[PDB]
Write a protein that binds this ligand. Structure first.
Ligand SMILES: Nc1ncnc2c1ncn2[C@@H]1O[C@H](COP(=O)(O)OP(=O)(O)O)[C@@H](O)[C@H]1O
Ligand code: ALF
Ligand SMILES: [Mg+2]
Length: 728
């Protein structure tokens, strides 16, 4: 029996709306009409259902939950849909498209663990915060080759539509998964990869593609206050296919990892998972060979007050990480080298600098220094000198500095952040060498960026993340509304322009603009000015934007913060350390020390120019900001060469709890994502069009010729959704 028609199947049980009863049938055939209204006009996102009891030519009168009757103009009313629509799979079918109506449909589905719903052309996914059995091999097989309208909403379905569009159109595709922090982007990405690896698979390669993930999550993910498994790097995964449509390989591009987390974490957060995995899961012999102990013994692990995550065993995860490294093909010596570096970082963090006779720092106890040097394979006298007495040029003269305690500690931190960041890039490079083995014919690119985030303290890391999220929202705006309406004009189909009111360009320009200069440009200029400080930097930003740019705020309550109004809301950024973060300095004497390491992995991190070298920009090294803007611009150029498919992940609440939809939290996301606007253009517009000549040869204007479902353009014929798909 076909699972899609069998009401006893797990497909029906977990992906279809449950059968209503006799009492529901009664309510469903009622002739009564209802409206969504706010009991408290100050709380615009809390709605109740009232019965419409009478009407005039221009008004409705309705009963409230408590009793009393209210009036409202017909043009301001948010009418409730007939309840036969509750649970509908595609919301472009609703008679009434308004905020509480769309939220209500998502709610009915979520209450019975139906997390996926279409909104016209894109998918909406609401995080369940629990396991639902809809990703087994048996589920994969059901979606295989099925068209969107033949099956229920699912991440698998949209993945298959991209795959078929790649085969039938011979063009590259992309799956763009949006969402604020913890919304479900990474979990959904994993399912897209799973599906494509199965439906287009032949083996070992497909397993290696899958086992790349645990390695990268171990080194690249950490507990933040918004997500227990937060991705602290962005990633674009290119799944590559041959001309026949079989998987031929994969390539991973990463985006700027949060190196600062290695040396500092806020209260309740954790460092990267890998540190806890090694300390919990190391063999008693490894622990002696690496001079390890428990987390509480290390400064880099004992400052947050949190060393574990509910429902996670770090010892079990370490076993998974190691099994992944084997399948991928990291040798046993390479693995030991990797953990020697992790262990050395921890030891470096334990070095305690103290004031000496004068202002220069000294090191009284050498225990931590010696254990680090042992595992890294470097000379401890050289390391010590490089940390506290690094040599620089003054003119052309060579002068030994003697750093104070604060500067010595900061330099040790820079070493640690460089070690960890370069290791991460090396891991990605090694994975890519294994997974990518053939020139591709086509690709489906899967984008999993770090999600929009706000904390008590927001720094340069959060500005880079949030800018990226704004750029991705504008790409949605561009393809859904802007490019769409421009086609209707060029083709004179008597289309009337609509302003959908979604435009992130002003904010994007405030951040990355070149003339006049934006925030990143002024940061770069200050970064190479020898007399610049964090105070001259914030003064410059206020001078250029305060009361001049509508997306900027100089706050009256602080002298070290500035505010940017993003699509997802206003964020206040603290300027402390931005110059040093943008320059990303590392004493050369530290690099010279580690170049002489006996370890074969440590030596590649400091001698491979693709990992250890930095591009020049005239007389200065390229800034972090300039490098990042360039990487992102290149991503966006690549996406513009694909046919994009969108998944909008929505977080239900801010507590990481299941079965708890919070009205204001969800509605804020639907508004700023442009979900309703996306539905309206899908209904009022003409998604399908093809040159008349190419239409006659497959399915000129006389030849080609229900009148409503098409319109004749200057060079193409335009169909609404419903017609062009239903004639082939
Ligand atoms: N479809 C899902 N099924 C089960 N758990 C999910 C699902 N999607 C999100 N998660 C839960 O939410 C958490 C955070 O989601 P994640 O995809 O890591 O966020 P981001 O959007 O920041 O990558 C996951 O670790 C998991 O606990
Ligand atoms: F925590 Al995320 F994208 F992994 F916001
Ligand atoms: Mg993630």
């Amino acid at each position: 029996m076909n699972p899609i028609h069998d009401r006893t199947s797990d497909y029906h049980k977990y992906l279809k709306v449950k059968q209503g009863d006799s009492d529901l049938f009664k309510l469903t055939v009622s002739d009564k009409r209802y409206i969504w209204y706010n009991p408290d006009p100050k709380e615009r996102d809390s709605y109740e259902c009232g019965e419409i009891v009478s009407e005039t030519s221009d008004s409705f009168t309705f009963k409230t939950v408590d009793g009393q009757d209210r009036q409202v103009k017909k043009d301001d009313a948010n009418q409730r849909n007939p309840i036969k629509f509750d649970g509908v799979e595609d919301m472009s079918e609703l008679s009434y498209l308004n905020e509480p109506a769309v939220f209500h449909n998502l709610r009915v589905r979520y209450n019975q663990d139906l997390i996926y719903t279409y909104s016209g052309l894109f998918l909406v996914a609401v995080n369940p915060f629990k396991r639902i059995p809809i990703y087994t091999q048996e589920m994969v097989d059901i979606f295989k080759g099925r068209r969107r309208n033949e099956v229920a909403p699912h991440i698998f379905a949209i993945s298959d539509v991209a795959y078929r569009s790649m085969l039938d159109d011979r063009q590259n595709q992309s799956l763009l998964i949006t969402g604020e922090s913890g919304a479900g982007k990474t979990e959904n990405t994993k399912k897209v990869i799973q599906y494509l690896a199965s439906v287009a698979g032949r083996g070992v390669l497909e397993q290696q593609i899958l086992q790349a993930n645990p390695i990268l999550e171990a080194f690249g993910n950490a507990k933040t206050t918004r997500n227990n498994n937060s991705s602290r790097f962005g990633k674009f995964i290119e799944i590559q296919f041959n001309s026949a449509g079989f998987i031929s390989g994969a390539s991973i591009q990463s985006y700027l990892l949060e190196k600062s987390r290695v040396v500092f974490q806020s209260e309740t957060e954790r460092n990267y998972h890998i540190f806890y995995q090694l300390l919990a899961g190391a063999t008693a012999e490894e622990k002696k060979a690496l001079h390890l102990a428990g987390p509480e013994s290390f400064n880099y692990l004992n400052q947050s007050g949190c060393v574990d995550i509910k429902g996670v065993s770090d010892s079990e995860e370490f076993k998974i990480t190691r099994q992944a490294m084997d399948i991928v093909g990291f040798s046993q010596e390479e693995q030991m080298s990797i953990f020697k570096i992790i262990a050395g970082i921890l030891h470096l963090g334990n070095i305690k600098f103290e004031k000496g006779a004068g202002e220069g720092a000294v090191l009284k106890d050498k225990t931590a220094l010696n254990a680090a040097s042992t595992v890294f394979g470097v000379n401890p006298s050289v390391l010590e000198k490089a940390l506290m007495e690094p040599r620089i040029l003054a003119g052309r003269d060579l002068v030994a500095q003697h750093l104070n305690v604060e500067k010595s500690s900061s330099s040790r931190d820079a070493l640690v952040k460089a070690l960890y960041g370069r290791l991460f890039l090396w891991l990605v490079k090694k994975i890519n060498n294994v997974l990518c083995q053939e020139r591709k014919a086509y690709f489906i690119g899967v984008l999993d960026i770090y999600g929009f985030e706000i904390f008590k303290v927001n720094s340069f890391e959060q500005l880079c993340i949030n800018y990226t999220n704004e750029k991705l929202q504008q790409f949605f705006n561009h393809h859904m509304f802007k490019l769409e309406q421009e086609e209707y004009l060029k083709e004179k189909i008597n289309w009337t322009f609509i302003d959908f009111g979604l435009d992130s360009q002003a904010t994007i320009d405030l951040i990355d603009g070149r003339q006049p200069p934006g925030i990143l440009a002024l940061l770069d200029e200050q970064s190479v000015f020898p007399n610049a400080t964090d105070n001259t930097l914030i003064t410059k930003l206020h001078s250029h934007f305060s009361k001049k740019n509508a997306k900027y705020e100089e706050p009256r309550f602080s002298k070290t913060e500035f505010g940017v109004t993003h699509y997802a809301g206003q964020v206040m950024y603290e300027i402390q350390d931005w110059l040093e973060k943008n320059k990303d300095p590392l004493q050369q004497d530290l690099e010279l020390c580690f170049k002489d390491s006996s370890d074969n992995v440590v030596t590649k991190l400091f001698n491979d120019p693709n990992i250890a070298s930095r591009a020049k920009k005239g007389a200065n090294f390229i800034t972090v900001a300039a490098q990042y803007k360039e990487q992102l611009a290149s991503l966006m150029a690549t996406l513009e060469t694909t046919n994009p498919h969108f998944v909008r992940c929505i977080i239900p609440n801010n507590k990481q709890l299941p079965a708890k939809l919070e009205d204001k939290v969800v509605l804020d996301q639907l508004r700023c994502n442009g979900v309703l606007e996306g539905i309206r253009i899908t209904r009022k517009g003409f998604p399908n069009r093809i040159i008349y000549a190419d239409f006659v040869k497959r399915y000129s204007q006389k030849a080609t010729d229900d009148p409503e479902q098409y319109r004749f353009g200057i060079t193409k014929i335009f169909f609404r959704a419903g017609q062009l798909a239903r004639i082939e």
